[PDB]
Subunit: 59 residues, 3 copies
């Protein structure tokens, strides 16, 4: 149940991430320094969030 | 509990979607071809995610 | 379990919010009127979503 919704929210957020990399791609000195670290933290966070989904889903 | 948070995350993500359509609206050949499919997949994903919330919420 | 993933999704969404404020910062009359209310609703929603995480996490 909640684990299903869990993966749905995680895909909406996965896709929006690609969409943001796009509007940042379109938009594009200190800016591309901030926008860059955020693109890395969110990729890590998306994977930790994925690995976790795989764990809750074993149960 | 988790179902409450579930809907909150789903609304934050619902709103950001409108906000992205806006920065894409402001930003705006192959770009508007990629950015377009993402706007459709995420709308479908937002609805599947909604219909699911309605299911987990019956319990 | 689901409460762990819960906070992960809430941080990915927390970060993307900063990233959007950035592409809106880069992008930037009625536009900055719509984009503004969305930046407020989502901040409120992020906090309600946080306070809620603190509640589900007491259990």
């Amino acid at each position: 149940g909640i684990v299903q919704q869990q993966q749905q929210l995680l895909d909406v957020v996965k896709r929006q991430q690609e969409l943001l990399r796009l509007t940042v791609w379109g938009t594009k000195q200190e800016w591309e320094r901030k926008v860059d670290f955020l693109e890395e933290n969110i990729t890590a966070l998306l994977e930790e969030a994925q690995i976790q989904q795989e764990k809750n889903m074993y149960e």
